[PDB]
């Protein structure tokens, strides 16, 4: 989860693409870190409203994948 850091480089990238520069969004995202292991579907809920619930599935899905996986390979 130092790749939660360089991850923050990722998340920042993808959302920044999907209007530019929005900050406290990105922070409501990563702000589910510190409960670590405990973050869930609800991420898709809250984030689901904040961005257009369409892109929602796309992102938070991709995330849950990279998180379960890079959660393994360590």
């Amino acid at each position: 989860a130092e790749k939660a850091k360089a991850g923050e480089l990722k998340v920042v990238n993808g959302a920044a693409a999907s209007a530019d520069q929005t900050p406290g969004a990105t922070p409501k995202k990563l702000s589910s870190w510190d409960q670590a292991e405990t973050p869930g579907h609800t991420p898709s809920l809250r984030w689901d409203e904040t961005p257009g619930r369409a892109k929602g599935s796309e992102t938070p899905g991709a995330t849950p994948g990279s998180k379960i996986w890079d959660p393994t390979p360590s």
Binding site: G40, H41, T42, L45
Partner: peptide, 12 residues
Amino acid sequence: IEDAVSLWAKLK
């Protein structure tokens, strides 16, 4: 179908 699944996880 999806949202009520997390709602039901909130239930139990």
